[PDB]
Amino acid sequence: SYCGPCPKNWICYKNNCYQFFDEEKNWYESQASCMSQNASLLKVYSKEDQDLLKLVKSYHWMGLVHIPTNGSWQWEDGSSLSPNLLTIIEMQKGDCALYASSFKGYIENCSTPNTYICMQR
């Protein structure tokens, strides 16, 4: 069976498209980058459908944003984080999060430059 469709130089896995970007940018720059490729930052919605994320090395911006006037974490598209997907770990005071294996999110200052993962589907 075929996987996709996905941009030419992207990784395809269970019909989701992923791309790693090694240029370090703040969270806002990274979101803008994925958007310019008609994608978004990594969104984690299923350990089963996205089990390749166990294989990811290093730490990378994903699309999770913290709403301080709530107790809320949400994805870019406004959807909620569902249960048993990410272990959220304090690291720095901030409103953004870095993905790390295995299915961890480290709270990070949105202004700090990091590598990032875009995702499309």
Binding positions for ligand VMB, rule: CB under 6 A = 11, 18-20, 52, 55-58, 117
- Decide which of ligand VMB, its own copies, none touches 3; Cβ closer than 5 to 8 Å per partner kind: its own copies
Lookup: tokens for 64: 């999770």
Q: What is the largest CA-CA distance in the chain?
A: 46
Peptide bond into 113 cis (omega under 30): no
What minimum distance in Å lies between the beta carbon of 91 and ligand VMB?
Answer: 18
What minimum distance in Å lies between the beta carbon of 57 and its own copies?
Answer: 6
What minimum distance in Å lies between the beta carbon of 73 and its own copies?
Answer: 28
Query: Which of 36, 55, 68, 93 is in the footprint of its own copies by CB under 8 A?
Result: 55
Query: Which residues have C-beta within 8 Å of that of residue 117, sequence separation ≥ 6?
Result: 18, 19, 20, 21, 41, 42, 56, 60, 61, 62, 99
12 touches its own copies by CB under 8 A: yes
- Decide which of ligand VMB, its own copies, none touches 117; Cβ closer than 5 to 8 Å per partner kind: ligand VMB
Which stretches of the chain bind its own copies, using CB under 8 A? Answer: 1-14, 20, 51-52, 55, 57
